[PDB]
Design an enzyme around this catalytic site. Structure first.
Site, short mmCIF file in Angstrom:
data_model
loop_
_atom_site.label_atom_id
_atom_site.label_comp_id
_atom_site.label_asym_id
_atom_site.label_seq_id
_atom_site.Cartn_x
_atom_site.Cartn_y
_atom_site.Cartn_z
N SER A 271 0.82 -1.20 0.00
CA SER A 271 0.00 0.00 0.00
C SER A 271 0.87 1.28 0.00
O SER A 271 1.95 1.31 -0.57
CB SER A 271 -1.50 -0.04 -0.12
N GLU B 223 -6.94 -5.32 -9.07
CA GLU B 223 -6.76 -3.93 -8.62
C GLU B 223 -7.05 -2.92 -9.74
O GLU B 223 -7.06 -3.29 -10.94
CB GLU B 223 -5.34 -3.72 -8.05
N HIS C 96 -6.92 -5.62 -3.94
CA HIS C 96 -5.96 -4.83 -3.11
C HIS C 96 -5.77 -5.37 -1.69
O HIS C 96 -4.66 -5.34 -1.16
CB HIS C 96 -6.34 -3.33 -3.10
#
Lengths: 262, 268
Positions: free
Chosen positions: A147, A209, A244
Site C-alpha cells: 500500500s 486492482e 488490493h
C-alpha cells in the site's frame, strides 16, 4: 445451563514493545515473533513488517509452520518485527499516512512527509533495540510494506538501499503525489554500484486492482527486470484473481521463499 | 522500551472439556467490529485453531471492511484448538480427525513406534455439534444457515468425512489438502453417500477443495481425481470449486488459497 472458563489469547514466543520516537514522541506498538528453532551462528534473519497491526500474525503463523521443514518449503526461521500502532484496528490512517510519505502532498489534509523521521526511528531507535535483545543476522534484514507501506519501502530502496537486504513490496501506491516517488528511481543503479550485499526485490500486485495500479506495477516490473546487476535480484508476481486487500496473504509464501536463505 | 503482551481486540479464549471424555480444548473466538446483520453473523469453524486462527482473523478483519470490493463477508471465527504452545497437536488431532480405528494388526515402521490413537471423529463431531456450537450460539449472534467448516490435512480428512456423513451440519466446507489416502482411502467408501445427503439438504452447500501443486504425487493425484468426480455430481444443492495452487506445498497452500476460499464461502 453450562459455563466456560473465559480467557485472553496469549501467543507463545511473542512479545510487544511500547516505544515513543525520540524526535516527535510518536507512540509505536512493536510486535515481535521469535522462532522456536535455535539461531544460526550468524543470527536470525529478521523481517520488518510495516502496518504491523494488520499483518503481524499472518507472517508469524506462516513462518512458524513453514520454517519447520525448510528444505521442503524454502522458508527460513526469522524473527518477525511488526511495526504498528497503539490501535484496535488493522491500520492507523493518519499516523501511517505521515510515516510512509516522503514528501508533503503537492498543491486541511492529514500531515504527509514523515518518511524521513520514520526511517530515522526504524534505523536509529527500533533496530538497535531489536539487535541488543535478539541475535540478529544484520546481512539478512527484510522490509515488507503494502500500500502506502509499499510506497515507503520503494522509497527506501531508491534512497537508502543498504538499510535492508530484501524488499517485499506489495501493491505500492506509486501513483501517490503525481508519482513523486518514481522521480528517485534514477538513484537505484547508482546505489547498486555501491551496495554492500546482493539485494532482493519482490514486487507483487493483485490482477483485479484498479487499472492505474496494475499498469504502474507492471511497468515498474519491466524497468527493474531490465537491470542487469550483480547486486540486484528482482522478482515480480501478479496474483491472478486477487484484489488490493487479498494480494498479501495470497503472495506471502512466494515472498517468504524469495527472501529466505535455504 | 516497555515490555508488553500482545492482546488482540475483539478476541477471546475459552477452556472447555468434552462431556464424554474430559478432553481439553482451547477455543479462540474473533468477532467482527461491524454489527451483526439482522439474522446474525456467518461463522467459520477452523480446525487446528492454534495453527490457523490468527490468519483467518486477520484476513477477515481486513477484507470484510470493503465487502463489495473483496467479496468477503464479516464472519465470526472459531478456532478449535488445543492447550499447546505449537501450531499442531500430535495425538489429540490424530484421534479427533480420524473416523476409523487403524487395525491393531497394522505393521509398524522401522522406528518401532506404536500407531497413534485413531477413530475419534465421531466423538469430536459430538463435541462440536452438541457442546461447542450451542455455547458459541449462546454468546454470539450466529446465522445458523451461514456456517463453514475449515480443515487442512488430517483436518481436511475430517471435513470430507462430515461432508459425506453429516452434510447438514455446515453449509460450506473449505477442504485443504485432505489426507484422502488415510487408512487405504477409507473415507471414500462414504463418497457415494453424498447424493443421499444432497437430496435431504436444506441449503445449497458450498465445497472448496484445494491442494498445492508441489505436494506428494499421491496427494496431488488424489485431490485431482476427487475434484473430477465432484464436478460430475450435478446437483442443485452442491456448489463445488477446486483450486490447485501452482508452485505451493503442503504447508503453504492454506495462506495462498485463503482469500479464494473466503470469497467462495461468503455471501456478498
Amino acid at each position: 445451563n453450562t459455563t466456560v472458563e473465559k480467557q485472553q489469547i496469549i501467543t507463545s514466543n511473542t512479545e510487544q514493545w511500547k516505544m515513543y520516537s525520540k524526535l516527535e514522541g510518536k507512540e509505536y506498538q512493536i510486535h515481535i515473533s521469535k522462532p522456536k528453532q535455535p539461531a544460526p551462528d550468524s543470527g536470525y534473519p529478521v523481517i520488518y513488517v510495516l502496518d504491523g497491526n494488520a499483518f503481524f500474525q499472518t507472517f508469524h503463523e506462516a513462518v512458524k509452520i513453514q520454517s519447520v521443514r525448510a528444505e521442503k518449503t524454502g522458508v527460513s526461521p526469522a524473527i518477525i518485527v511488526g511495526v504498528g500502532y497503539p490501535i484496535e484496528g488493522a491500520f492507523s490512517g493518519e499516523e501511517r499516512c505521515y510515516d510512509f510519505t516522503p514528501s508533503v502532498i503537492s498543491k486541511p489534509w492529514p500531515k504527509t512527509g514523515g518518511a524521513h523521521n520514520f526511517f530515522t526511528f526504524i534505523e536509529e531507535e527500533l533496530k538497535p533495540q531489536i539487535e541488543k535483545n535478539f541475535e540478529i543476522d544484520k546481512g539478512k534484514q527484510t522490509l515488507f510494506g503494502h500500500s502506502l507501506g509499499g510506497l515507503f519501502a520503494l522509497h527506501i530502496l531508491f534512497t537508502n538501499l543498504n538499510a535492508f537486504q530484501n524488499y517485499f513490496i506489495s501493491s505500492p501506491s506509486i501513483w501517490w503525489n503525481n508519482k513523486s516517488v518514481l522521480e528517485k528511481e534514477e538513484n537505484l543503479i547508482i546505489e547498486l554500484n555501491n551496495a554492500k550485499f546482493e539485494t532482493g526485490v519482490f514486487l507483487t500486485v493483485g490482477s483485479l486492482e484498479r487499472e492505474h495500479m496494475v499498469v504502474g506495477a507492471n511497468e515498474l516490473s519491466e524497468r527493474l527486470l531490465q537491470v542487469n546487476h550483480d547486486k540486484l535480484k528482482f522478482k515480480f508476481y501478479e496474483a491472478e484473481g486477487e484484489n488490493h486487500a487479498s494480494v498479501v496473504p495470497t503472495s506471502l509464501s512466494k515472498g517468504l521463499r524469495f527472501i529466505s536463505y535455504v
